[PDB]
Design an enzyme around this catalytic site. Structure first.
Site, PDB file in Angstrom:
ATOM      1  N   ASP A   1       0.847  -1.190   0.000  1.00 36.16           N
ATOM      2  CA  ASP A   1       0.000   0.000   0.000  1.00 36.16           C
ATOM      3  C   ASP A   1       0.884   1.243   0.000  1.00 36.16           C
ATOM      4  O   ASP A   1       1.349   1.671   1.063  1.00 36.16           O
ATOM      5  CB  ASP A   1      -0.888  -0.001   1.240  1.00 36.16           C
TER       6      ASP A   1
ATOM      7  N   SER B   1      -0.426  15.597 -12.092  1.00 39.23           N
ATOM      8  CA  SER B   1      -0.636  15.233 -13.482  1.00 39.23           C
ATOM      9  C   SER B   1      -0.873  16.489 -14.309  1.00 39.23           C
ATOM     10  O   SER B   1      -1.405  17.488 -13.819  1.00 39.23           O
ATOM     11  CB  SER B   1      -1.831  14.285 -13.592  1.00 39.23           C
TER      12      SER B   1
END
Length: 330
Positions: free
Chosen positions: A35, A199
């Site tokens: 994770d 992004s």
């Protein structure tokens, strides 16, 4: 040193991925959910409340000659999906794909919430975010990667998740055969303890690319792709009959649909998520309403590049002095 381990989807939807991990002496092998959105290595154990164990493999520290109680240490964690677990702490030897750390904090669950009990395939979590998020008190503990880093050939790990197929976590090296083209690296903020990056925009299907900054986290422990409501609406508007359902808890679409791809930007580069990766199947057994793999982050507080996005790429988690993320097509 290096390590390399195969990671395997837990079910036919890729809801999560499990990676075998050796703990203790003699080894006890548990299948952990790696994770990159958390920083605790915790396991089902001989201390877990018996009624909360249902098929998982347990760690029994009393059977490990290298286990030592970390005296006074406790831990307690809550995840973004409302699940939780807590307990006490041992140190022990932990190996992943041939890479060994001695003295790793292994957090032994005394209590787990129902969603963990109900998932018989996940024996615990191995956190790979920054150690500043580790919940052990009163002495915070380091992640497996943080402990291994100095020994690794290169201070990196990579995630290569498969679509409906096994993939690989590598530690200490970049497998240049595992991706196409070049790796595009992008800046990371560690201020919230995550692999947080920006992004450069998105496209829906064959549509034109929209240049827009989207801050989010690379999180292998989250199944879906959670993005701003504007972006998610633009995606689902291209699918006839798709709608946001308050009763189901997100966007659903007709199971008869063919979904468009979704592209996200990494600098000047582009990662394309095929439409099939966005199909999470019937909302309930036999339904013709299917659950979408791209959902709004509006209720989270952060955008999450979960497995739906990461499995479309070869992802480098670069833990150099200034951390960065790398993405390549594959």
């Amino acid at each position: 040193s290096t390590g390399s381990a195969t990671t395997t989807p837990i079910d036919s939807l890729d809801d999560a991925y499990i990676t075998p991990v050796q703990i203790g002496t003699p080894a006890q092998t548990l299948n952990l959910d790696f994770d990159t959105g958390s920083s605790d290595l915790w396991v089902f154990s001989s201390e877990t409340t018996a009624s909360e164990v249902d098929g998982q493999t347990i760690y029994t520290p009393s059977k490990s000659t290298t286990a030592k109680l970390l005296s006074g240490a406790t831990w307690s964690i809550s995840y973004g999906d409302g699940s939780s677990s807590s307990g006490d702490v041992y140190t022990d030897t932990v190996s992943v794909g041939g890479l060994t750390v001695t003295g790793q904090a292994v957090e032994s669950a005394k209590k787990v919430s129902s969603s963990f009990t109900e998932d018989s395939t996940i024996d615990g979590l191995l956190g790979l975010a920054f150690s500043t998020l580790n919940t052990v008190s009163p002495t915070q503990q380091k992640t497996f990667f943080d402990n291994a880093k100095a020994s690794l050939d290169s201070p990196v790990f990579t995630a290569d998740l498969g679509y409906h197929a096994p993939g690989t976590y590598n530690f200490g090296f970049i497998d240049t055969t595992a991706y196409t083209g070049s790796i595009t690296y992008t800046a990371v903020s560690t201020k919230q303890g995550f692999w947080e990056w920006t992004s450069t925009g998105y496209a829906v299907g064959s549509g034109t690319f929209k240049s827009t900054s989207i801050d989010g986290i690379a999180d292998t422990g989250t199944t879906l792709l959670y993005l701003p409501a504007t972006v998610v609406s633009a995606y689902w508007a291209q699918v006839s009959g798709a709608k946001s359902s308050s009763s189901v808890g997100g966007y659903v679409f007709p199971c008869s649909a063919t979904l468009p791809s979704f592209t996200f930007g990494v600098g000047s580069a582009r990662i394309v998520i095929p439409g099939d990766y966005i199909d999470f199947g019937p909302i309930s057994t036999g339904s013709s309403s299917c659950f979408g793999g791209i959902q709004s982050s509006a209720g989270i507080g952060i955008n999450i590049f979960g497995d739906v996005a990461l499995k479309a790429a070869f992802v480098v988690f670069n833990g150099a002095t200034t951390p960065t993320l790398g993405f390549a097509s594959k």
